């Protein structure tokens, strides 16, 4: 079933066994271990330094534990990047998800990461969002106008950008 | 061996861009074979493993620990960062970060490591020390991958990076327990499989990092040897190029099937 991929990321939801993951992504291109702990780690399209990927983290190391977190990189396209330095600037810790969306185009960002600390409870839900300029997404893993929004419990704690102009 | 020089030139016609190399006796430090030995190409990931003996300098000196653990938030955070993501709310130590900046070109590991030796300027001043009076950073991860032409930001010279990276490895700069845990880092790097690595025949030994960068760049240094030891270097970088990954990848092996044969 190829290398992992935007819709096998978006296909695994939390809650899912470590053998509903190896499942969707492919074993093949997964891991545990080593450098990631509990956790599954599975890589896109590689190319070397820099390659596309998904870790899914789980409750516990037990081999009934449950998808508790997801993060990727370079898996998932904005689906209309309009971010500007500008807008990114009227950004404002405290703001809620809905509000900073408004703030930086409706479909700006992405998912770099979610995760739930209290699973099943969804208290101090931790989210981080990847937001790109029109130019600045890239699935070759070189960016050109991005940003990091993280929040906890659906309210804006910071932010930080690279190359928007 | 001339022959390699052969590929070397060719490499550089296909991919429209300047390639450097140098092959280096590890022993002796002398040069058996080079191209533009003393033009400048960006570091990229490579200059990590510059990073990682500063800080085992530091770690010999009594001033820094392997297993020190770095409790870092989401602030510090950069792209490119498989392993420093997943390990954020429960920290990494100075040893787990070099394996990832190493062997995966973690960036934010790199940035956290170069916060603990004081910064690109301090890398700088640790390479210049050690009589390297060439090699400099000067930004940190993601910005120094810019590549930008005749930029001698974040930039070294293949035969000055050769001569580091023996250095580094041999000299008594770092105390044995510490060259040995560079170059086991390097020898598990994850990242290079398409480099050096796949024309690399069983029973040979090859500790490397890799980077890539903006603007076609792309680059390797490497410490192997035949029968399980290292005995040269090789140095690889080119810069400029329009060609794919994959296709500088495929340059970039050919050379290292030269060298091979020609050992």
Same mark, same amino acid.
Not at chain 2, 25 to 31: H, Q
Not at chain 2, 171 to 175: H, I
């Given at each position: 079933a190829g290398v992992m991929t935007g819709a096998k990321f978006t296909q695994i939801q939390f809650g899912m066994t470590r053998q509903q993951v190896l499942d969707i992504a492919g074993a093949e291109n997964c891991e545990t271990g080593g450098?990631? &702990?509990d956790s599954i780690h599975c890589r896109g399209? %590689? %190319? &070397?330094?820099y390659y596309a990927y998904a870790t899914f983290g789980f409750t516990? +190391? +037990? +081999?009934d534990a449950k998808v508790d977190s997801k993060s990727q990189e370079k898996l998932l396209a904005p689906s209309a990047p309009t971010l500007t330095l500008a807008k990114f600037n009227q950004v404002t810790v405290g703001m809620t998800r809905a509000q900073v969306l408004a703030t930086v185009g409706q479909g700006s960002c992405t998912t770099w990461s979610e995760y739930y600390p209290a699973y099943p409870s969804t208290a101090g839900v931790t989210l981080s969002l990847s937001c790109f300029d029109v130019? &600045?997404?890239?699935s070759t893993g070189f960016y050109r106008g991005s940003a990091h929004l993280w929040f906890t419990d659906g309210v804006l704690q910071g932010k930080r950008q690279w190359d928007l102009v | 061996h001339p022959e390699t020089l052969v590929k070397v030139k060719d490499a550089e016609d296909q991919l429209g861009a300047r390639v450097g190399y140098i092959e280096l006796?590890?022993?002796?430090?002398?040069?058996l074979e080079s191209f533009r030995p003393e033009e400048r190409f960006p570091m990229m990931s490579t200059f990590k493993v510059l990073l990682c003996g500063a800080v085992l300098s530091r770690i010999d000196a009594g001033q820094?620990?392997?297993?020190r653990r770095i409790h870092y938030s989401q602030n510090d955070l950069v792209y490119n960062s498989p392993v420093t993501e997943k390990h954020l709310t429960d920290g990494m130590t100075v040893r787990e970060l070099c394996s990832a900046a190493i062997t995966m070109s973690d960036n934010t590991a790199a940035n956290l490591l170069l916060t603990t030796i004081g910064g690109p300027k301090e890398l700088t001043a640790f390479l210049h020390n050690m009589g390297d009076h060439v090699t400099r950073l000067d930004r940190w991860? =993601?910005?120094?991958?810019?590549?930008? =032409?005749?930029?001698?930001?974040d930039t070294t010279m293949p035969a000055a990076m050769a001569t580091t990276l023996r250095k580094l490895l041999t000299?008594?700069?770092?105390?044995l327990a510490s060259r040995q845990q560079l170059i086991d880092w390097m020898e598990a790097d994850?990242?290079?499989?398409?480099?050096l690595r796949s024309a690399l025949p069983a029973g040979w030994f090859i500790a490397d990092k890799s980077g890539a960068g903006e603007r076609g760049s792309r680059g390797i240094i490497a410490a192997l040897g035949p029968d399980?030891? =290292?005995s040269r270097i090789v140095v690889i970088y080119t810069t400029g190029?329009?060609?794919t990954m994959d296709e500088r990848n495929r340059q970039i092996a050919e050379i290292g099937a030269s060298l091979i044969k020609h050992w």
């Open positions: 450098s990631f &702990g399209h %590689a %190319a &070397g330094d516990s +190391a +037990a +081999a130019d &600045g997404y890239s | 006796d590890l022993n002796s430090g002398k040069i820094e620990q392997l297993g991860e =993601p910005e120094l991958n810019e590549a930008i =032409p005749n930029d001698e930001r000299g008594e700069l770092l105390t994850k990242v290079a499989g398409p480099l399980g030891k =290292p190029s329009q060609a």
